[PDB]
Write a protein that binds this ligand. Structure first.
Ligand code: CLA
Ligand code: CLA
Ligand code: CLA
Ligand code: CLA
Ligand code: CLA
Ligand code: CLA
Ligand code: CLA
Ligand code: CLA
Ligand SMILES: CCCCCCCCCCCCCCCC(=O)OC[C@H](COP(=O)(O)OC[C@@H](O)CO)OC(=O)CCCCCCCCCCCCCCC
Ligand SMILES: CC1=C(/C=C/C(C)=C/C=C/C(C)=C/C=C/C=C(C)/C=C/C=C(C)/C=C/C2=C(C)CCCC2(C)C)C(C)(C)CCC1
Ligand code: SF4
Ligand code: SF4
Lengths: 165, 40, 75, 144, 80, 64, 733, 37
């Protein structure tokens, strides 16, 4: 398929891998009773193992000669062949959360700079203010862009200290 | 009580609660959606 | 120093409690030479349940090297 | 104020002795002598290690380097409120006096002192190292 | 011998002179500051380079600077 | 009659200062013709723990 | 006062042992010597370069002499596949009889060392066939060494010392070095290949005794002067040619076959002849570019002055840079090390994948040593390139003469440069380490299918563009309908495509997820090492913590415990910290090269593909698995030929660990300990009769960092060299 | 003509490993300790 890979659902090595893991679990099972606590736990593990291998095949992943899933990172190849969920979609999932955390922290830091004693507002968190800013961060991408266009996102070069040069 | 709630607002106490919450959420998600590898 | 003593008692209490609730001590008493002492059990999350090894006595858990089973038997 | 003259026969404190004293340097290059007056017999700490009792009246000690003499001077002034003075003595018998150079301790401003190694500029107004290059020796811009 | 320089930002606090453990520095009269006194370095041949004087200077940047130079028995702080 | 007013905010222009391009509060200005009459206080300490320093008239400018 | 060192009165007046150490360590810093002038500085450097050249040709002479005297070159040339080359003989009186027998091998008279430098394959390829060929070369290079040494003496004499302006004639030196040093040397080397090397590869002897009566080509120079240059490319060596013999050979002397000789698995000699002829023409032409005494050509100052973008994006542009470069030797040395350092890496990259010497590929130990050798040397040269760039800023940079040009503007946004290098290093480290740890946890819990394996699609896409058809991209040279495929289909693609699609050679090895992780670790190494070195240079002249750092020099201990503490604040210390990251980076590169090749050489590439995605595989399947033979070189039952590498392996660990002492424990502890030793000696009877002349003292703060770094580096190198050779040679050799 | 005698290592190895180093160290030790006129 892509880069010589093949769908895991059609991969011989992938299928053989599932048998090896289930065989290992089954070997430990036969040293216990039918419905003892250890036996139930082992059976639960085997169910998750079977579900995991079905899910990855159902997801249409690609397996190499190793018979293990490989991920596609190029946006063009991902959207071309329906691998957007491996790296492309999770890319924009992380950035939203990462920007959320960073934007919320920046809002709080600016908020307390106006207080009389900013340092004491950092070791001892102002929880009522932090919760207020935590919820308003859901719209950070909109607020972040508008700050950039209005020119209030960055400090002036003349207001930043620098070493002799 | 005002001072006690002030103590709970100190950085080490907040971080413990926050990460205890954050870790619990991630642990619980993986308990009900085991083995997530692809968004799908 | 009272705080240090109080902490040791919580620690000692935990060791005795985990022996009662999460151990194969009773099975170990019957077959001490074949059953491995174990007093810690892990939850089945993110696939960490493999650490619950086969220790004997129809029990799965982490094998302990603290020697608490031998101390309890002697007493 | 006039430069004091050292008296080699001045009595010394009651001290058993230690292995932290003078070495062969004192016999070949130089050593240092500190003298002071004691109001009463008292125990002080030797910079070389141990405790010694100062006799009432004049006292004299010999040390291997200048810093040891000025370390004892700080102890005597701060705790016992004394006024010690020490010299540099050479093996040839010459004696050089210092601290206080002019009789007044340097912390206190005194008329008649001439400023030395004073630059009438800031640190940020020194020239660049390139401008003092090939001056015959490694020279910092601060020197010129 | 090390090099010790006093710059015209000195405020005459005398802290450098007190800090020096070898009596290298001293205070002299001056008219360039409120205290009317300035630090001086007349005995740099006894300087060891500890830089306790720089630790004690309040001015920013420092008004007393030590440039470690040629070594000797005195500057190397040897008693042997 | 020389220098900025007491309590006003000034911006430091000494490149070798810890507070270069930073704003501080004027505490007093010496009128005796000394080299560095202006005294400025800062809310953030420098690497030595100091929060005050003396500056010349031309090394400080009014906020903005 | 003491005489030594004669070049510094400050050191000569020091009564302590620091005088001895510092006298050695400042010998070659001519700029810091007493009474030095600019003109005398250049004449000393010119003389020193003659000394270096004489050592190089003498070192080469020694190699030629010992192989001929004690090697088995004449036997090796007969059957290079199944004979181990001999480096030199061993005469160690400490050896026991089992050791003497163990090291006797290759049909030698007595104990010998096996060569790993590849000189046998190199010399055999260029036409050497007998021991007398090597003897004449050895005497010739010993003579050349003497001549350069004499020239070093000659140009120090009163009437032969060049003036200062002579060393600053940039246009004339570039014209000569490009056309003569590069161009003519490459043209001369083409002459050797056409006249000597190629005929020797076809079974015809050509030496100084008969080369004037032997025709390199059947048509002698008629094609050359008539423009029919294609005649020289007709009837090349066939695929059945047996190297060194006339069976299967051809007649062409200039070709573009583009592949590997089927038997020797190395580049064709007729391609290497046409290669050197081609660049020689380019270099000779390129050497007529600059102004001289004849009224034509460019003046480099004019070129720099012109290139200022009209929009002011680069400020003043390149105005004033000619004097900045022409007057500073540290700027020139930094450019020379940076350029040479990169080319050393390029040599390593291209020599393992395009082996130019016959039978080089099959000698696995030689290939491993050659790649590791040059990559570690490149790493050191790159660190030096930045060190001397930092020295330039402190010593030679003049802000007034560089006002507003590109160089000055680099200091203007140095925080931006350093901040972004910091971000890239953090990003690569977090995600590179994180993915490895994720894959390790998955393997530990027995779920190898849950790990994150990212296909190197971008790199696999490049391999497709070059003709590797495995990935099915059908791109450019991988597609038989593209114009790129068609145009080159008659010149070099048939040979190139045949080689790139052969999976038994190292030409564009197949890559997978294991290669993805390692490459991103290499990027982390390059960026972090650059971060440390770049910070050391841009902050060399000063910083907020030390605004006037330039007044103290390139290398000083510290500024004391005031202002919070200033340990390792000089630009010298930034280089010192960067050497650690350089070793770490080159280590990752050489581990990656070695493991990927061991699996290839054993045919089991699957091991690397499977075990390289988590860090336990490296520790288990590479370091632990391949140490089995090394550490058995000597054991309670006996010893074998690997006992020298086993001994050297532990020898490296010891020097490495000793370096920790100089890096962890600092001076104050040791100076106070030495003071009781001085007391003990003076009070001891029968020993205080003897006395010292230099007062014992502890090493300095700066010295111990260098001494600790030297032990760290030496132990680093010797440990891996012993393991690299022992694991590779024992496995196959 | 070039081939050295078979006994060359027996002489040169001790000479360059034990003898010349001894003279070199003695030369260097005396040189560094030498005092200026
Ligand atoms: C990190 C850099 C990078 C690299 C090395 C590649 C590499 C590749 N991309 Mg990807 N791509 C990237 C980033 C990158 N991409 C980004 C950031 C985006 C936007 C989110 C895309 C969007 C994208 C699309 C929409 C497509 C590719 C495709 C490709 C492949 C061929 C064309 C190409 O991009 O040539 C080298 C890459 C560059 C010079 C960088 C810019 C590439 C642009 C954005 C896309 C060019 C598409 C091209 C015009 C398609 C023509 C048809 C093709 C079959 C020949 C190649 C494997 C094509 C594919 O799937 O081929 C099989 C394709 O259709 N890429
Ligand atoms: C670079 C770091 C890195 C990355 C990218 C990942 C990524 C992943 N790890 Mg791994 N891991 C890492 C480091 C990393 N790991 C390290 C250092 C360790 C050692 C402690 C582990 C140990 C580990 C284990 C033991 C497991 C993983 C698993 C996972 C998966 C978790 C998916 C999930 O929870 O979805 C949950 C879904 C979400 C949406 C979470 C975010 C929730 C917010 C609220 C969404 C907001 C949206 C707007 C994912 C593929 C799990 C797996 O199955 O992997 C295949 C798993 O079992 N990791
Ligand atoms: C030294 C003290 C000590 C330590 C290190 C542990 C450690 C542990 N205990 Mg134990 N425990 C202790 C003392 C200790 N215990 C004492 C004194 C008691 C008596 C009240 C208990 C009662 C107890 C119970 C009832 C349980 C544990 C469990 C656990 C495990 C999970 C804890 C967790 O994540 O809770 C969740 C984290 C937060 C609430 C935060 C862990 C191995 C659990 C276990 O092993 O389950 C299989 C479990 O069920 N412990
Ligand atoms: C044609 C005239 C000519 C020639 C031949 C040279 C030659 C040389 N000059 Mg120059 N020089 C000239 C004119 C010339 N000069 C003029 C006119 C001036 C006055 C303006 C100068 C002023 C001058 C100075 C001031 C200095 C030199 C120096 C040198 C030496 C540089 C070091 C060296 O050997 O590099 C050899 C380099 C190469 C052979 C090429 C290296 C780059 C290639 C690409 C590397 C890879 C090639 C190949 C793959 C390697 C194969 C390896 C093998 C093991 C297989 C070199 C011998 C320096 C020196 O050492 O003096 C003693 C020096 O200090 N020259
Ligand atoms: C052709 C390139 C070149 C040249 C001409 C120079 C020239 C110079 N360099 Mg530079 N340098 C280079 C390459 C070069 N460098 C490289 C590759 C690096 C990176 C490693 C550096 C890093 C560097 C630094 C960090 C410094 C210099 C400095 C200097 C100056 C003084 C050198 C000195 O006194 O050494 C004296 C030599 C020694 C004290 C001993 C050197 C040998 C070392 C310690 C390793 C020894 C290993 C040992 C042999 C192993 C034994 C193994 C055992 C088993 C037997 C001088 C102008 C110094 C200077 O003053 O700059 C302004 C300086 O600070 N260089
Ligand atoms: C294995 C050893 C090691 C490691 C891991 C690092 C790591 C780092 N070094 Mg260091 N360094 C080392 C050895 C090491 N160094 C040595 C021997 C030297 C010679 C003195 C140096 C000299 C040096 C210099 C001079 C510089 C660095 C820099 C860096 C950073 C590079 C960027 C990076 O990877 O960011 C990613 C970060 C990491 C990989 C660090 C580890 C992160 C861990 C895994 C996080 C775990 C968190 C988790 C919740 C558990 C917490 C538990 C705890 C609360 C109990 C990073 C912090 C550069 C820097 O600071 O750049 C910004 C830099 O300038 N290093
Ligand atoms: C720099 C080059 C170089 C190097 C590293 C070596 C290294 C070695 N040589 Mg060799 N050698 C060289 C050049 C070199 N040689 C040259 C050019 C000659 C021709 C005169 C010789 C002649 C020679 C002899 C005759 C012997 C060695 C031997 C040795 C070994 C012990 C050292 C010794 O006795 O040296 C002695 C070196 C010389 C007599 C010549 C030194 C010349 C320079 C200019 C001084 C050692 C493997 C010994 C050996 O093989 O032991 C097993 C031995 O017996 N060498
Ligand atoms: C290249 C350097 C080198 C050489 C040639 C030798 C040679 C020797 N070493 Mg080794 N050694 C070296 C370096 C070297 N060593 C180093 C660097 C170290 C420190 C790591 C050691 C530590 C060491 C130890 C600890 C021992 C040796 C011993 C030996 C001897 C082993 C063979 C034997 O049975 O001798 C038997 C020796 C003889 C039959 C006598 C040989 C001639 C004697 C030693 C000198 C005669 C001098 C003569 C009468 C008058 C002066 C002549 C002169 C002016 C020409 C041999 C003499 C062993 C030994 O026996 O030492 C005495 C021994 O115990 N070495
Ligand atoms: C849809 C069509 C969109 C067309 C956009 C054209 C933008 C042209 C660049 C303006 C950019 C611009 O404003 O240049 C301004 C500046 C050049 O400075 P100068 O002072 O020399 O010139 C100022 C000029 O504006 C007028 O002389 O360059 C840059 O800042 C970046 C240059 C990038 C150079 C890129 C080289 C080519 C790389 C390959 C790119 C793909 C090929 C096609 C694009 C060239
Ligand atoms: C700090 C400093 C310094 C230093 C620096 C350095 C050390 C640097 C380095 C640098 C480097 C080291 C760089 C590199 C670069 C590179 C590059 C830039 C490359 C490029 C390439 C290309 C462009 C290619 C292309 C191609 C391809 C890819 C394929 C096909 C072919 C071709 C050709 C097309 C100095 C001395 C100046 C002084 C001042 C300061
Ligand atoms: S140098 Fe500094 S510490 Fe000394 S008197 Fe001047 S301001 Fe005070
Ligand atoms: S460096 Fe030390 S000895 Fe020298 S002047 Fe400063 S405090 Fe005194």
């Amino acid at each position: 398929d892509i880069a010589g890979l093949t769908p895991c659902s059609e991969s011989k090595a992938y299928a053989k891998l599932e048998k090896k893991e289930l065989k290992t679990l089954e070997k430990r099972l036969k040293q216990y009773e039918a419905d003892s606590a250890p036996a139930v736990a082992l059976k639960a593990t085997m169910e998750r193992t079977k579900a995991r291998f079905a899910n990855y095949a159902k997801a249409g992943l690609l397996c190499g000669n190793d018979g293990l899933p490989h991920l596609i990172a190029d946006p063009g190849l991902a959207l071309k062949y329906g691998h957007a969920g491996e790296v492309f979609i999770p890319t924009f999932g992380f950035l939203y959360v990462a920007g959320y955390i960073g934007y919320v922290g920046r809002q709080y830091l600016i908020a307390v700079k106006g207080e009389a004693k900013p340092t004491d507002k950092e070791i001892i968190i102002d929880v009522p203010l932090a919760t207020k800013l935590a919820w308003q961060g859901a719209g950070w991408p909109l607020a972040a862009v508008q700050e950039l266009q209005r020119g209030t996102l960055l400090e002036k070069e003349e207001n930043i200290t620098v070493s002799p040069r | 009580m005002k001072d006690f709630t002030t103590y709970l607002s100190t950085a080490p106490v907040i971080a413990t609660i926050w990460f205890t919450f954050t870790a619990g959420l991630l642990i619980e998600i993986n308990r009900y959606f085991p083995d997530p590898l692809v968004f799908s | 120093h009272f705080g240090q003593l109080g902490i040791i008692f919580i620690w000692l209490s935990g060791m005795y409690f985990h022996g009662a609730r999460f151990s194969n001590y009773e099975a170990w008493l019957s077959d001490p030479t074949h059953i491995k002492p174990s007093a810690q059990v892990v939850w089945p999350i993110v696939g960490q349940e493999i650490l619950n090894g086969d220790v004997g006595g129809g029990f799965q858990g982490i094998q302990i090297t603290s020697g608490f089973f031998q101390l309890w038997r002697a007493s | 104020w006039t430069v004091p003259t050292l008296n080699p026969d001045t009595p010394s404190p009651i001290f058993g002795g230690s292995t932290g004293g003078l070495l062969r340097k004192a016999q070949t290059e130089e050593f240092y002598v500190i003298t002071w007056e004691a109001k009463k017999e008292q125990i002080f700490e030797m910079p070389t290690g141990g405790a010694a009792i100062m006799r009432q009246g004049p006292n004299l000690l010999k040390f291997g380097k200048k810093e040891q003499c000025l370390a004892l001077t700080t102890q005597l002034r701060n705790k016992f409120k004394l006024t010690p003075c020490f010299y540099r003595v050479f093996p040839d018998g010459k004696v050089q006096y210092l601290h206080p150079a002019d009789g007044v301790y340097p912390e206190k401003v005194n008329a008649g002192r001439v400023g030395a190694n004073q630059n009438m500029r800031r640190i940020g107004q020194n020239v660049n190292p390139i401008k003092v290059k090939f001056s015959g020796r490694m020279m910092s811009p601060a020197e010129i | 011998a090390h090099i010790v320089k006093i710059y015209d930002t000195c405020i005459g606090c005398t802290q450098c002179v007190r800090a020096c453990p070898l009596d290298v520095l001293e205070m002299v009269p001056w008219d360039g500051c409120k205290a009317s006194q300035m630090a001086s370095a007349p005995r740099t041949e006894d300087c060891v380079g500890c830089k306790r004087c720089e630790t004690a200077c309040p001015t920013d940047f420092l008004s007393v600077r030590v440039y470690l130079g040629s070594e000797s028995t005195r500057s190397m702080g040897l008693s042997y | 009659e020389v220098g900025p007013k007491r309590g006003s905010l000034v911006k430091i222009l000494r490149p070798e200062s810890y507070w270069f391009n930073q704003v501080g509060k004027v505490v007093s200005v010496d009128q005796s013709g000394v080299r560095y009459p202006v005294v400025v206080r800062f809310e953030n300490q420098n690497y030595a723990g100091v929060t005050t320093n003396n500056y010349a008239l031309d090394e400080v400018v009014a906020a903005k | 006062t003491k005489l030594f060192p004669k070049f510094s009165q400050g050191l000569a007046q020091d009564p302590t042992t620091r005088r001895i150490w510092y006298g050695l360590a400042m010998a070659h810093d001519f700029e810091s010597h007493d009474g030095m002038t600019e003109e005398n500085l250049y004449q000393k450097i010119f003389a020193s370069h003659f000394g270096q050249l004489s050592i190089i040709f003498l070192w080469t002479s020694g190699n030629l002499f010992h192989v001929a005297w004690q090697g088995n070159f004449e036997q090796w040339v007969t059957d290079p596949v199944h004979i181990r080359p001999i480096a030199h003989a061993i005469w160690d009186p400490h050896f026991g009889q089992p050791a003497v027998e163990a090291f006797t091998r290759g049909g030698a008279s007595g104990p010998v060392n096996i060569s790993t430098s590849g000189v046998y394959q190199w010399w055999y390829t260029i036409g050497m066939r007998t021991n007398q060929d090597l003897y004449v070369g050895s005497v010739f290079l010993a003579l050349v060494s003497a001549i350069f040494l004499f020239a070093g003496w000659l140009h120090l004499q009163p009437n032969f010392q060049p003036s200062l302006s002579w060393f600053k004639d940039a246009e004339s030196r570039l014209n000569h070095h490009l056309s003569g040093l590069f161009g003519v040397s490459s043209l001369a080397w083409t002459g050797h290949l056409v006249h000597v090397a190629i005929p020797e590869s076809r079974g015809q002897h050509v030496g100084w005794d008969n080369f004037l009566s032997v025709l390199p080509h059947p048509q002698g120079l008629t094609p050359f002067f008539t423009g029919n240059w294609a005649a020289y490319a007709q009837s090349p060596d066939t695929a059945s040619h047996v190297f060194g013999t006339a069976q299967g050979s051809g007649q062409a002397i200039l070709t573009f076959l583009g592949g590997f000789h089927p038997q020797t698995q190395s580049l064709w000699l007729t391609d290497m002849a046409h290669h050197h002829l081609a660049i020689a023409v380019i270099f000779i032409v390129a050497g007529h570019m600059y102004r001289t005494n004849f009224g034509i050509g460019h003046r480099m100052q004019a070129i720099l002055e012109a290139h200022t973008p009209p929009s002011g994006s680069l400020g003043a542009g390149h105005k004033g840079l000619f004097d900045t470069v022409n007057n500073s030797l540290h700027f020139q040395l930094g450019l020379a090390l940076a350029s040479v350092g990169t080319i050393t890496s390029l040599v390593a990259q291209h020599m393992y994948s395009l082996p130019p010497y016959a039978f080089q590929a099959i000698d696995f130990t030689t290939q491993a040593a050659l790649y590791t050798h040059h990559q570690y040397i490149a790493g050191f040269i790159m660190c030096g390139a930045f060190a001397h760039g930092a020295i330039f800023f402190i010593r030679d940079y003049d802000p007034e003469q560089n006002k507003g040009n590109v160089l000055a503007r680099m200091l203007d946004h140095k925080e931006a440069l350093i901040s972004h290098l910091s971000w890239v290093s953090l990003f690569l480290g977090f995600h590179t380490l994180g993915l490895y740890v994720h894959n390790d946890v998955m393997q530990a819990f027995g779920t190898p299918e849950k790990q994150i394996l990212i296909e190197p699609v971008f790199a696999q896409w490049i391999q497709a563009a070059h003709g590797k058809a495995l990935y099915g991209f059908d791109f450019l040279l991988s597609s038989k309908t593209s114009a790129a495929f068609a145009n080159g289909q008659s010149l070099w693609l048939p040979g190139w495509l045949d080689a790139i699609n052969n999976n038994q050679n190292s030409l564009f090895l197949t890559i997978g997820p294991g290669d993805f992780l390692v490459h991103h670790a290499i990027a982390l190494g390059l960026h972090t090492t650059t971060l440390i070195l770049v910070k050391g240079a841009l902050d060399a002249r000063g910083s907020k913590l030390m605004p006037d750092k330039k007044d103290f020099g390139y290398s000083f201990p510290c500024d004391g415990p005031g202002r919070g503490g200033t340990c390792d604040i000089s630009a010298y210390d930034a280089f010192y910290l960067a050497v650690f990251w350089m070793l770490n980076t080159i280590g990752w590169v050489t581990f990656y090269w070695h493991w990927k090749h061991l699996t290839l050489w054993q045919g089991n590439v699957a091991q690397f593909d499977e075990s390289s995605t988590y860090l336990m595989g490296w520790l288990r399947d590479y370091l632990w698995l391949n140490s089995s033979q090394l550490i058995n070189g000597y054991n309670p039952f006996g010893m074998n030929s690997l006992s020298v590498w086993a001994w050297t392996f532990l020898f490296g660990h010891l020097i490495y660990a000793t370096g920790f002492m100089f890096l962890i424990s600092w001076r104050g502890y040791w100076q106070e300990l030495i003071e009781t030793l001085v007391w003990a000696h003076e009070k001891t009877p029968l020993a205080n009769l003897v006395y010292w002349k230099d007062k014992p003292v502890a090493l300095s703060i700066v010295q111990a960092r260098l001494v600790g770094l030297a032990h760290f580096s030496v132990g680093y190198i010797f440990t891996y060299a012993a393991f690299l050779i022992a694991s590779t040679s024992g496995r196959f050799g | 003509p070039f081939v050295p005698p078979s006994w060359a290592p027996s002489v040169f190895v001790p000479l360059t490993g034990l003898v010349l180093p001894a003279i070199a160290m003695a030369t260097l030790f005396v040189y560094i300790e030498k005092e200026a006129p």
